[PDB]
Design an enzyme around this catalytic site. Structure first.
Site, PDB file in Angstrom:
ATOM      1  CB  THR B   1     -28.172 -11.339  -1.411  1.00 36.32           C
ATOM      2  OG1 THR B   1     -27.758 -10.858  -0.128  1.00 36.32           O
ATOM      3  CG2 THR B   1     -26.948 -11.761  -2.199  1.00 36.32           C
ATOM      4  CG  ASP B  17     -27.588  -6.193  -3.911  1.00 37.45           C
ATOM      5  OD1 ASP B  17     -26.837  -7.183  -4.007  1.00 37.45           O
ATOM      6  OD2 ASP B  17     -28.589  -6.180  -3.170  1.00 37.45           O
ATOM      7  NE  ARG B  19     -30.654  -2.604   1.519  1.00 37.25           N
ATOM      8  CZ  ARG B  19     -31.887  -2.154   1.333  1.00 37.25           C
ATOM      9  NH1 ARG B  19     -32.901  -3.008   1.273  1.00 37.25           N
ATOM     10  NH2 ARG B  19     -32.114  -0.853   1.212  1.00 37.25           N
ATOM     11  CB  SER B 129     -32.987 -13.092  -1.195  1.00 35.14           C
ATOM     12  OG  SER B 129     -32.619 -11.745  -1.426  1.00 35.14           O
ATOM     13  CB  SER B 169     -31.809  -6.708  -3.156  1.00 37.01           C
ATOM     14  OG  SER B 169     -31.431  -8.072  -3.196  1.00 37.01           O
TER      15      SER B 169
END
Lengths: 204, 220, 240, 240, 250, 232
Positions: B1, B17, B19, B129, B169
């Site tokens: 993330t 993103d 994901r 992250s 990510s």
């Protein structure tokens, strides 16, 4: 874990104009089965089902609390429920028990009540929705189920090959799992009829 | 993330993103981490996915209630005050990392909100992250009062840095441009990764699965 | 006519009236006082006299001009005890806007909060409806000055120049002949009409001690109470 | 009649008779006056001896709210001790929360809102008391306030409560007040009490005097009463 | 404080109630309904009190409130006093299903409402319900059932019923033309068209002024039927044909 | 309070509720209004008279939005209107927090009247003195509902409340028909507003809001002055 107490597996898969959903049949306590007829897929109106996996207490509890709120909704309104409306309803019911959570992971499959448009989604144990276009899976043997559907799913599929794809996805993934098995039931629904079959699996 | 934002000379550019992971297994290849708040204010979420979703809907419900009462356009400091006061009351048990951005009468405003209640007004922020990778792109290549196409080049570069360096990510890149009048929302912006083609025909025809008991139920 | 307890509590008459609230409108009139508000192009002026019947009674503790916030002042009519308790309701909820919402409260949003409170006095039937009236001023961004009025019935509307107190029917009849004949409003144009409307209704031509003037202008948005020296400057200014 | 029962119903001309009845209930009590010099406030209360009725020093109507704040109550007696318990309680919370002495302007306002609160509901009655508030501070000066049963509270240089109110304030304005020291005023207040209340009504009366100011270092206490005895000596020089 | 109380709790000096009798006379005006079963199936007759030609009629449902998959009701009295009761009784039937996972029998659902309606008459001085209503339903123990309700919390089992004051004369017809288990569902319907012909003083029985809803037992479905406006008209023309046929003897 | 909680509205010996009948008298003495549903959207129109030349017109509003597709007007008393607006504003949000979907127009009228009916039965309060008109184009077909202080609600093709509401009732029965357009509906809504208004009708004498399937929209005084050509 608490999720691995009874085990289980629920898979849904979107086809061309139809949608299919399947689950296992085993009810057990950590090494020891009890029966082979534990229901995990529950009808919520016509052409729209729901599947539950995880702790068998919260399977039977949430499926009755959701049925409680559903009949009140379909009597205050005259219409049936839309699939987006049910996903927001379930995500409300799990988030209320934010800190004393239910140990289950729902899977919703169904069609449009106006058109043939399918719908699939799955949720977390606290209630984060997640919609896709190909498949959703839930249960203990999750990683085996991702290896099937990433290698077998095709975009536009007739209801015959959709049945043959979700059958080979379950029979190869659940037999690799230890605590899940003892038969697989498959629902394949479409605009005009509902077909329910039981597969021939390894009973070991 | 990996979420990020910046303030150029006329507005605010946000990006992320798509994901959403689960453990170490990719659960969602196309998520959605940019949310609606008002017609001028959006918000990006990070951390616990259900905690960010259920919080961002309550404040967006309250600001719709507030602005329809006042009959005016909301302000970004109003949404900042609600979030830092709500999250402080729950003592950080609700883990929600937020980036708040919008254009007011006073102009563009960007905030970063930590899950305990500490808030910061900054010209550019990163959360998540892989936020450390995007911050190195910002500090190396920031200059004040950029244009719109220069800023859209910068954010899409910084989000892609978290894609190719962080495990959590990596997906398609979202963007959003919020200006004084124009609102642009780009659910695809750049596709950096594809899936390879399937080489082997794996299909056995209909009838290769043993069935014990069938059942037919017609409908209307 | 009387039916049930229509003359006593807040219930409906057979005609559809309810008498306790329209008994409260003439509860203002025992104050013996008249307040005038005038909004101009870039300024808003409150003007109100006072009566000091005793030499032993003080001078600074009489004034009805009540600074609510740094940018919003108000004036009160009606009876005194109900007027002052109305003010700390307004002071309390103005501060809650800063704590809940950060930015400064508009002058229009405050009269929504007050009139909804004064609804419940009418709406419930075991509480006294606070027979005092409310007049606000203030400067808004991209809207200029404003003048509002709250009522014990609990309804509000904006104005351009509107008096209150005892002599509404004489003052508003003066202002309608005054406003609509294409008058350009400077700063002192609003102030000179604010005295001379009151000076013709009451027919006094007063000393500079009896009246008070609160002012706000878009060059200094702070609410400001004038001094008797500069009140005397504007008073001899209209004395040609 | 028919509208004067509750304190939550308006009269059909615009007032409340339950407040009107309790005001003249205060009127039937004896005379308590108050005055301030340039560096202090002097209290004076006439007290009536009926036949014997008490050990002298009983039930004195000069209470003591704070170290620098005093009372001078009149009207009904038992509710005055209730208001003294409210005012002592209010000054303690200001001390605990804000860490310094209560200003007299706030202490008047907090009590007057509490007196106002019993004029709105049918469950309770209005108070039958009226009193004074005197204080002194080197950063503020000497302040003197006054609260009616309705809840109106503002300032004075001198005031009087009781039967003799208008007849007692005619000679208060005859004095000078700015240039006086309060020790001169202590023997002045003695004669205003002594001029009024001829012994045709009640043969026996007795004088109390309370006194806060710059000489008392801001602290409130009673006068040295048996000491120095220049109240009664200088007052009985009014024989002609 | 004390002189404003209305005292809707004290008995009458005759030794009876005083406020409930005022309430029960409001039911006779503003509404007329009935229901009849004698065999497999049960009907409900409704009547449009307001039949003005600028209404929408887009609810596509009416006084027949389908409160369950096996039951519905027909209400007459104060209109939105029912909407409190219909939403409440719908949830009592649903919290039963949460507790047992079995559909609610029609008897004890009526007892649940009649304990609520009595509770305002027992204590408080709260204004009681000015609502009487009917009941239709199928169960596993007795099949098709009818129940009358009262504002007093009293009920009872019935096979032909009445609500409106105009339908007090219908009771005299229902004693004359009722049978013992011969309810073919045309004889029960032609009787209901015959009752509302004489009772309702609106001449010729316009199809828009009335409404009929039936409940038939399917294999396991218990189909609740709200029949449309076309087949009302041919039932009226059937009854007008039988009136012209029966007058040939005179 | 103390806990008295006794309802001041009881039955008559005739079997009627007297205070509800008296509250409808205050509704009939209210400002006139009209609402027309014609086949693509709903047109609401009210009659806003400033009593003096000193009042401001851009301050107090009558056509009031609830959602982006739901509008609401009234005919009754002013201050009681603003109570149940703010009640209905909040009540539309708990549908949207639960279901994540805009609330249908039939669903408010179930819930707003349930607030309003229980409020009459409750203890120590009078009923409201406001009737409502609620509009909205939910799911293609638009809707037009009318509540009242008695707690009831209806569904009108076209109706009118306020003063001379029976005169405009006969007017709408003859002038209106089965189907129209949105622009024809505004023409006859002013025609029934001109039936009972004063002499001059300007952009401030009336105030009109409409629904579309594109959403609820409130008209500015520019186009109302522009539609005032070919008046009534």
């Amino acid at each position: 874990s608490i999720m691995s107490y009874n085990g289980g597996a629920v898979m849904a898969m979107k086809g061309k104009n139809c949608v299919a959903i399947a689950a296992d049949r085993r009810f057990g306590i950590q090494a020891q089965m009890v029966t082979t007829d534990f229901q995990k897929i529950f009808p919520m109106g016509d052409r729209l089902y729901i599947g539950l996996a995880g702790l068998a207490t919260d399977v039977q509890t949430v499926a009755q609390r959701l049925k409680f709120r559903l009949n009140l909704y379909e009597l205050k309104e005259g219409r049936q429920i839309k699939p987006y409306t049910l996903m927001s309803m379930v995500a409300n019911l799990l988030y209320e028990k934010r800190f004393g959570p239910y140990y289950t992971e729902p899977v919703i499959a169904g069609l449009d009540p106006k058109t043939f448009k399918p719908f699939i989604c799955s949720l977390d144990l606290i209630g984060c929705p997640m919609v896709t276009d190909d498949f959703v899976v839930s249960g203990t043997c999750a990683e085996q189920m991702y290896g099937m559907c990433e290698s077998l799913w095709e975009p536009n599929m007739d209801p015959d090959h959709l049945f043959e794809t979700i059958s080979q996805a379950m029979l190869n993934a659940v037999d690799r799992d230890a605590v899940s098995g003892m038969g697989v039931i498959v629902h394949i629904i479409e605009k005009d009829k509902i077909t329910t079959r039981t597969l021939k699996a390894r009973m070991d | 993330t990996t979420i990020a934002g910046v303030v150029y000379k006329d507005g605010i550019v946000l990006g992320a993103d798509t994901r959403a992971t689960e453990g170490m297994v990719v659960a969602d290849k196309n998520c959605s981490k940019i949310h609606f708040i008002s017609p001028n204010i959006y918000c990006c979420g990070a951390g616990t996915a259900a905690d960010t979703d259920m919080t961002t809907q309550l404040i967006s419900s309250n600001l719709e209630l507030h602005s329809l009462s006042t009959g005016r356009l909301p302000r970004v400091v109003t949404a900042n005050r609600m979030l830092k006061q709500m999250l402080f009351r729950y003592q950080g048990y609700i883990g929600a990392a937020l980036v708040l951005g919008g254009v007011d009468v006073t102009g563009p405003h960007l905030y970063s909100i930590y899950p305990h209640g500490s808030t910061d007004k900054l010209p550019y922020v990163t959360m998540g992250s892989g936020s450390l990778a995007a911050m190195a792109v910002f500090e190396d290549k920031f200059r004040p009062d950029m244009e719109e196409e220069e800023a859209k080049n910068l954010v899409s570069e910084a989000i892609a840095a978290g894609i190719f360096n962080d495990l959590g990510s990596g997906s398609n890149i979202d963007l959003c441009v919020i200006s004084k009048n124009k609102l642009d929302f780009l659910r695809p912006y750049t596709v950096p990764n594809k899936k390879g083609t399937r080489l082997g025909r794996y299909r056995c025809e209909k009838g290769t699965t043993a069935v014990l008991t069938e059942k037919i139920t017609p409908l209307e | 006519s009387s039916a049930g307890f229509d003359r006593h509590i807040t219930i409906f008459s057979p005609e559809g009236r309810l008498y306790q609230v329209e008994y409260a409108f003439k509860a203002i009139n025992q104050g013996g006082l008249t307040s005038v508000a005038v909004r101009g192009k870039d300024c808003a002026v409150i003007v109100t006299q006072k009566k000091v019947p005793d030499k032993l009674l003080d001078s600074s503790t009489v004034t009805h001009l009540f600074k609510i916030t740094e940018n919003i002042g108000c004036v009160m009519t009606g009876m005194t005890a109900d007027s002052r308790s109305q003010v700390q309701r307004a002071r309390y909820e103005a501060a809650n806007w800063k704590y809940k919402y950060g930015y400064e409260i508009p002058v229009d949003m405050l009269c929504k909060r007050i009139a909804d409170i004064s609804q419940v006095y009418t709406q419930n039937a075991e509480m006294r409806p606070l027979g005092c009236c409310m007049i606000l001023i203030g400067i808004d961004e991209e809207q200029g000055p404003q003048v509002y009025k709250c009522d014990p019935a609990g309804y509000y509307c904006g104005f351009k120049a509107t008096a209150a107190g005892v002599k509404q029917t004489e003052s508003t009849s003066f202002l309608e002949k005054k406003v609509k004949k294409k008058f350009d409003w400077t700063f002192e144009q609003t102030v000179e009409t604010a005295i001379t409307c009151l000076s013709t209704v009451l027919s006094i031509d007063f000393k500079p001690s009896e009246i008070e003037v609160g002012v706000v202008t878009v060059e200094n948005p702070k609410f400001r109470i004038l001094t008797e020296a500069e009140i005397d400057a504007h008073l001899v200014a209209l004395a040609e | 009649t028919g509208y004067d029962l509750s304190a939550s119903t308006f009269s059909p001309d615009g007032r409340v008779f339950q407040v009107e009845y309790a005001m003249k209930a205060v009127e039937n009590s004896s005379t308590a006056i108050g005055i301030r010099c340039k560096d202090g406030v002097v209290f004076g209360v006439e007290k009536l001896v009926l036949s014997k009725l008490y050990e002298e020093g009983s039930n004195k109507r000069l209470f003591n709210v704070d170290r620098h704040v005093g009372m001078a109550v009149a009207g009904l007696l038992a509710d005055a001790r209730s208001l003294a318990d409210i005012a002592r309680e209010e000054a303690s919370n200001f001390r605990s929360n804000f860490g310094y002495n209560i200003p007299l302007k706030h202490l008047a306002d907090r009590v007057a809102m509490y007196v106002h609160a019993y004029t709105l509901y049918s469950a309770v009655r209005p108070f039958g008391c009226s009193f004074m508030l005197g204080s002194y501070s080197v950063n503020d000066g000497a302040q003197l306030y006054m609260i009616d049963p309705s809840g109106v509270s503002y300032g004075y240089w001198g005031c009087a409560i009781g039967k003799a109110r208008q007849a007692a304030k005619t000679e208060i304005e005859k004095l000078q007040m700015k240039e006086m020291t309060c020790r001169d005023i202590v023997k002045e207040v003695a004669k205003i009490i002594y001029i009024v209340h001829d012994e045709v009504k009640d043969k026996a009366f007795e004088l109390e005097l309370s006194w806060v100011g710059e000489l008392t270092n801001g602290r409130h206490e009673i006068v040295p009463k048996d000491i120095r005895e220049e109240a009664e000596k200088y007052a009985k020089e009014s024989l002609k | 404080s004390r002189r404003y109380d209305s005292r809707t709790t004290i008995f009458s000096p005759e030794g009876r109630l005083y406020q409930v009798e005022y309430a029960m006379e409001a039911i006779g005006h503003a509404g007329t309904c009935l229901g009849i079963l004698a065999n497999d199936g049960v009907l409900l007759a409704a009547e449009r009190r307001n039949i003005h030609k600028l209404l929408d009629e887009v609810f596509f449902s009416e006084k027949i409130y389908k409160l369950n998959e096996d039951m519905a009701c027909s209400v007459a009295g104060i209109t939105s006093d029912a909407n409190v009761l219909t939403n409440e009784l719908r949830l009592i039937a649903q919290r039963y299903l949460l507790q047992y996972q079995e559909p609610i029998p029609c008897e004890q659902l009526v007892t649940a409402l009649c304990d609520i309606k009595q509770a305002y008459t027992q204590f408080g001085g709260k204004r009681p319900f000015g609502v009487s209503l009917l009941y239709i339903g199928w169960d596993k123990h007795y099949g098709f059932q009818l129940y009358q309700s009262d504002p007093s919390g009293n009920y009872g089992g019935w096979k032909a019923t009445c609500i409106g004051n105009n339908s007090a004369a219908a009771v005299s017809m229902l004693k004359q033309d009722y049978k013992e288990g011969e309810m073919t569902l045309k004889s029960a319907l032609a009787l209901a068209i015959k009752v509302l012909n004489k009772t309702m003083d609106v001449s010729k029985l316009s199809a828009e002024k009335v409404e009929i809803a039936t409940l038939t037992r399917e294999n396991g479905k218990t189909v609740i039927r709200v029949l449309k406006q076309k087949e009302v008209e041919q039932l009226i023309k059937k009854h007008e044909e039988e009136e012209a046929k029966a007058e040939r003897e005179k | 309070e103390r806990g008295y909680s006794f309802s001041l509205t009881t039955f008559s010996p005739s079997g009627k509720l007297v205070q509800i009948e008296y509250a409808l008298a205050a509704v009939a003495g209210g400002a006139p209004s009209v609402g027309i549903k014609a086949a693509n959207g709903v047109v609401l129109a009210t009659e806003k008279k400033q009593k003096s030349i000193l009042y401001d017109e851009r301050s107090v509003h009558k056509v009031e939005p609830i959602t982006k597709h739901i509008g609401l007007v009234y005919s009754g008393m002013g201050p009681d209107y603003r109570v149940l607006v703010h009640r209905a504003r909040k009540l539309a949000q708990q549908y949207y927090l639960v279901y994540q979907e805009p609330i249908p127009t039939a669903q408010l009228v179930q819930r707003v009247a349930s607030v309003m009916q229980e409020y009459t039965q409750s203890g120590g309060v009078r009923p409201f003195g406001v009737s409502l008109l609620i509009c909205g184009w939910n799911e293609g077909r638009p809707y037009l509902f009318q509540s009242d202080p008695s707690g009831a609600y209806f569904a009108w093709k076209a109706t009118a409340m306020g003063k001379n509401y029976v005169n405009g009732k006969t007017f709408l029965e003859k002038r209106y028909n089965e189907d129209l357009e949105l622009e024809d509906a505004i023409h006859t809504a002013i025609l029934t507003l001109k039936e009972s208004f004063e002499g001059q009708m300007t952009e401030d004498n009336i105030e009109v809001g409409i629904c579309n399937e594109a959403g609820f929209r409130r008209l500015t005084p520019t186009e109302v002055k522009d539609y005032l050509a070919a008046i009534a």
